[PDB]
Amino acid sequence: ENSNSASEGSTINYTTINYYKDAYAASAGRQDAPPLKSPSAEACVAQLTIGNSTITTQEAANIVIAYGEWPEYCPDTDATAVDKPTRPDVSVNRFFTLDTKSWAKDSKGWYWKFPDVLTEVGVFGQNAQFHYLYRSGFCVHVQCNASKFHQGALLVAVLPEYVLGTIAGGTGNENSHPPYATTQPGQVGAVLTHPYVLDAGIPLSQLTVCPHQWINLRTNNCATIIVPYMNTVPFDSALNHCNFGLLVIPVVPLDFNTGATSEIPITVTIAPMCAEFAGLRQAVKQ
């Protein structure tokens, strides 16, 4: 028998029936913190230092490790491109802070795409443009300060392969598509027009099935999520493909009494982790 079944190479063993020389012709048969509940760093004044930069959190049980997996360089068993990759390390795996957003009582919510956010920032950006192939994980840190008299709750989540959709002309008759500035808004991010369906026909209420953390003003002022590289290929174009989107949505609206500070910003600070590149040539912006 040829070992060409789709399940060949998995830890689970199935008992199947077959009458042909190819394994995939066989019957499906029968088989014979949790990765999905946003595992905290512990389950798997504080200071996270990476490169020449340091942010300050409070607890390791407050850092989510997406899918329970820490970022890593691509192993030889999964690699396919044969050139030696460049792993610049400290010049690219460090914290970059993007433009700050302003949280208002009627804000809808925002999203950023990765690695799009940094393709034009620092040495990371340069490497992303000079190489065809890119790969990395990310430490995502969202910051929001308010007083003990303010209230509100942001859901901060990482949605892998965040494909956006349109309102189809309102009536649903128009097969319109999101424009480039909407699918890859860059460093400044973009605003959601229908946060309830994440501008993609899926419920915000179930977004917690993805790696996430809440920023509930009365309890915390920051959220930190560590994201491993996720894709169906070991390396990919940092320009053509965004591996995941970061969503920051006010599920419980911001509120405070008149006279309390009304300028409440939200700041995103991100650090590539284990960034590596391959397929060197001239710089390409898109």
Binding site: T97, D99, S102, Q143, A146, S147, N221, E263, P265, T267
Partner: protein, 97 residues
């Protein structure tokens, strides 16, 4: 550690005590620059008020890492985050955050 006169303005030379601390306050525009100064310990400017700066002046050359401590003296009810950066040689004051 000794106090750095970061707020070394021409306009407060007659009320020198005001040079010993600098303001932070509610901003209406994000990413604002709060204060900037060079990191040369023996150079004219904020470091001159420190005993480190004054002893540096009894020598021609120095070497080593320095530490700048910032103490927020607002109320317990005030909160916020600042980004403090050290930019190695190459240009002028970074234009933005």
């Amino acid at each position: 550690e000794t106090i750095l006169e970061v707020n070394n303005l021409k306009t407060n030379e007659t009320t020198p005590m005001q040079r010993l601390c600098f303001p932070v306050s509610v901003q209406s525009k994000t990413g604002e620059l709060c204060a900037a100064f060079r990191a040369d310990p023996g150079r004219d400017g904020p470091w001159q008020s420190t005993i480190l700066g004054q002893l540096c002046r009894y020598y021609t050359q120095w070497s080593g890492s320095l530490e700048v401590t910032f103490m927020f003296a607002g109320s317990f009810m005030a909160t916020g985050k600042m980004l403090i950066a050290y930019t190695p040689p190459g240009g002028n004051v970074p234009a933005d955050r």
